[PDB]
Amino acid sequence: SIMSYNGGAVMAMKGKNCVAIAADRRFGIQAQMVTTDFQKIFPMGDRLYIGLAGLATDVQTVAQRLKFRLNLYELKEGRQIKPYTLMSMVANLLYEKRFGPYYTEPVIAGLDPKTFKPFICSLDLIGCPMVTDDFVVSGTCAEQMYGMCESLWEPNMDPDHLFETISQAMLNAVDRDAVSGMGVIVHIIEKDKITTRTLKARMD
Amino acid sequence: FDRHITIFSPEGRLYQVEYAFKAINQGGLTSVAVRGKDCAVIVTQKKVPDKLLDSSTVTHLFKITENIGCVMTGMTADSRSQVQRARYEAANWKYKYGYEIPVDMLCKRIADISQVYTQNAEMRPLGCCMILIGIDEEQGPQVYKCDPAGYYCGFKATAAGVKQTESTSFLEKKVKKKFDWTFEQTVETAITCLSTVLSIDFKPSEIEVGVVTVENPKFRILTEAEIDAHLVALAER
């Protein structure tokens, strides 16, 4: 397949007045690992992040071309961006290539910078958004992560438990996908602090 | 100087656009339009100087659609162009949107076209006025006029041509009394206005009358045998 040429895995999960996002740290060609500190989560503001799994060329291209538009936006505008609007910006950016598509399936997670209610979204490679209220996944291990988040997720979760949930899903999912792993990184973002952790994961 | 090309003057005025209102009076004819409760009528005079012309070709009334009719006043060649553009726009409206164009919208489309000629120095404006008529679904009969500058408005009655002030005085004097408007009263009012301002004692050959009604919304240009019926009734009372 196409997106399995580089691999990847991204997850997002909400709490009560908080949200999380996680990704694996591997870069490799078809079956060979090249690098173990590859970036797949990109900040798009304070209390707002985006994650990208797919073809690495398209990951970097989409991130750079989106930061372009975001910087011009918040310069013309006098305000930081809402997540609902970043979702539509990405949808437009991807649907402009409806027949030349970027091979990415982004995942967004953030807090509105006035009322700080959490937000999580998912998009396809041509920009159909998907605003769930429990969790979203994208990558090569999507079924394996659906199976974990369906069983472990609970409605109201403080950050100490949300971290455990989004970590125990990612670890046990990427431990059954051959082209995803070699580390897992997690971001927890609240009104007052953004916490960031790398986890003890298998490197096989 | 501030009168040759479409630039602004120190007092904020466009003189080449005012001079296109003066070309309307070069044809030497006057048009009148009147609105009723169930009808809308347009009237103009039909002046052939030669007996060698075919009177069938000498007209200023035009069919834009089956339900919209026009009378054009001013330079004769400009009017045919504006009429063909009106027809093209009416046809493409229905091709695109699936229903017949109103008069309210066709008028402002022509006005939008005319305003570009005032804002761009490519082409000259057209020395022609235009009065349209048509029956609307909810609004009823409509009378609309547009200018060389891109101004448009709806009217109860109006005129276009040389005898336009002395026609709009007659009309505003008759409109205030607010009688029971009818087909016959409407046509009589129009013919009496055109007779008073010209003082000519019309024949059926010297005018052409187009009408549109709520009963029959199809625009139809009248015959000499049907204008005589309204002309005879005038001499009575």
Partner: protein, 220 residues
Amino acid sequence: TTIAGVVYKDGIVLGADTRATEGMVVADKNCSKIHFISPNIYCCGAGTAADTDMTTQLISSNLELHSLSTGRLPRVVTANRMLKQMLFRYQGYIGAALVLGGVDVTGPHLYSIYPHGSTDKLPYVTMGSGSLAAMAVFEDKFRPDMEEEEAKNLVSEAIAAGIFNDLGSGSNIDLCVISKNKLDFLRPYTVPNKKGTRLGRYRCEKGTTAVLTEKITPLE
């Protein structure tokens, strides 16, 4: 996917499911397949979701631009003629199959539009993957000049037939009722499927996850 429509004595009733798949796997559960076109015109969409979203959005903007110049209420023929003229221009590469319905001065109209630019105006239309199950109900139970609640029951039965007999449909039934003097967008209308209550608990306590690196970054 499963979408349907009917024309009853006073107006229009539309219906749709909420499931969205990417393969043989369920991605969304509470999708919204009934789209705004105008305060009197709504549309249901099957096929490639992004195509339907962008198409409906574009025609919505163009009608909000047309109605604002005219100052009148839009018509359904206008939306139909826009949609079909675009989809015919793309020769089917836009996978937008639609069920469009509204109420204007001429009365209630309902259309089905296919991605190559063909159109059918009918008193009842179905579309999606559960089309055949829905129409199996419409052919057996439809009547002209029905009431509002009869029509709503019929459409709910059709969407439920598409749900419980097709694999690509499920998880809810939405409706939209349109009339000359009212509009009622019902999201959700019925919930025929509910996940099972879980017996055990797997809440992970602080410490079960091992960490190598930590960072904090205060904000205000």
